[PDB]
């Protein structure tokens, strides 16, 4: 089946270059064109360009000079190179398939990829500090106790939070991240039967891909 998956660098510095890949599956690039679209934070969609089956490309004139699209038929990959970044190039970048073989001729973007988030910033990568969130109020609320981990001061996003190496899938909530002075902070919570904790250990596992850092915090009363 028709699938499109983007992969990109995550963090890039102003005035440098951006390269993203669209890996397609379920259709051949020798027969279908692919479009590149971006969505700046709290903005609508903006078309960047298309590469047709035959190799011709067309670009949004506003970008025309800084953008370049190319492909690898055998590899099922489309690439977007974007230069002269400014922080306003921060966006979700999407690839979508081009289609026109309809009953009456018309061009349509029929299947969309899931997107890849690119942060354009001169801010430094900084590993997180992990703190346990324990009830404090150790009074039995009911049968369940809810615990958490505070992931503080990291850049850039994302961070991955797991409980007891994925075992606890049980009402796990990973909240959206807040950004204060270029450092993100997020929390994750887990709900467990109160008869269990602290008898049975609860550990949160945090991974910060950009700093290749892994931290585990055991949550104790």
């Amino acid at each position: 089946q028709v699938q499109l998956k983007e992969s990109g660098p995550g963090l890039v510095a102003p005035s440098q270059s951006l390269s993203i890949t669209c890996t397609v599956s379920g259709f051949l690039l020798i027969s279908n064109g692919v479009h590149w679209v971006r969505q700046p934070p709290g903005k609508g969609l903006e078309w960047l360009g298309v590469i047709w089956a035959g190799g011709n490309t067309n670009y949004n004139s506003a970008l025309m000079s800084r953008v370049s699209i190319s492909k690898d038929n055998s590899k099922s990959q489309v690439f977007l190179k974007m230069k002269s970044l400014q922080t306003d190039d921060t966006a979700m970048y999407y690839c979508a398939r081009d289609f026109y073989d309809y009953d009456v001729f018309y061009y349509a973007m029929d299947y969309w990829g899931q997107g890849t988030s690119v942060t354009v910033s001169s801010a430094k990568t900084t590993p997180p500090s992990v703190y346990p969130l324990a009830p404090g109020s150790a009074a039995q609320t009911n049968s369940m106790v809810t615990l958490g981990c505070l992931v503080k001061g990291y850049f850039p996003e994302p961070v991955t939070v797991t409980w007891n190496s994925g075992s606890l899938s049980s009402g796990v909530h990973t909240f959206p991240a807040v950004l204060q002075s270029d450092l993100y902070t997020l929390s994750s919570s887990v709900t467990v039967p109160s008869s269990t904790w602290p008898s049975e250990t609860v550990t949160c596992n945090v991974a910060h891909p950009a700093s290749s850092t892994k931290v585990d915090k055991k949550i104790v009363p």
Partner: protein, 210 residues
């Protein structure tokens, strides 16, 4: 130029008909512009609905239709459902490029309301060593996705030091959010009661600690 505009927000209720329009800065919308209507669903789920002005994609509900209303392209939803609540983007082809409109935010009333679950967490001893203290107020399973959280230190409402996240959609279509009160370790030790008060559609849910 070749600026496509759409209404920015529209609201309907289930069973009503709503028409969304798409205008070209350049002139009347024609068949040759192949108006495409794309739907954006929470957490960047894009789905193509109509292509070439009036061709509904095969998986799309029969209640979606597209047409040329005068000089503009139109998307009509006949008997709108709660799940039609999304952002709708219009795109027009101009022989060598596509131009997307700003998108229309469609709100469908009659959605099922849900009150927030609030949890208040004290600063950890580990964090206090660093001379900072963060109180964490988690809010889950609420609908619609807009709350108001107020914090009080020793009965007195706090003015500064709090940060609230923008609500996010959970797998279950309800929302989540988090509020943070950052104090210095000193301040933490100078006060006694801490309260997180969350206001959702007229009601208030507060949680406290000592």
């Amino acid at each position: 130029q070749a600026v496509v505009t759409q209404e920015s927000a529209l609201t309907t209720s289930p069973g009503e008909t709503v028409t969304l329009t798409c205008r070209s800065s350049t002139g009347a919308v024609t068949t040759s512009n192949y108006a495409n209507w794309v739907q954006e669903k929470p957490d960047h789920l894009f789905t193509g609905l109509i292509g070439g002005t009036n061709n509904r994609a095969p998986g799309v509900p029969a209640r979606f239709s597209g047409s040329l209303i005068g000089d503009k392209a139109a998307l009509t939803i006949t008997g709108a459902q709660t799940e039609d609540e999304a952002i709708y983007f219009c795109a027009l082809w101009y022989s060598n490029h596509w131009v997307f409109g700003g998108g229309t935010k469609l709100t469908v009333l009659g959605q099922p309301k849900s009150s927030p679950s609030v949890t208040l967490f004290p600063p950890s001893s580990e964090e206090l060593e660093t001379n900072k203290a963060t109180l964490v107020c988690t809010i889950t399973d609420f609908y619609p996705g807009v709350v108001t959280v107020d914090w009080k230190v020793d009965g007195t409402p706090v003015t500064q030091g709090m940060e609230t996240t923008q609500p996010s959609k959970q797998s279950n279509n309800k929302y989540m959010a988090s509020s943070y009160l950052t104090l210095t370790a000193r301040a933490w030790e100078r006060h006694s009661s801490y309260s997180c008060q969350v206001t959702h559609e007229g009601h208030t849910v507060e949680k406290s600690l000592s």
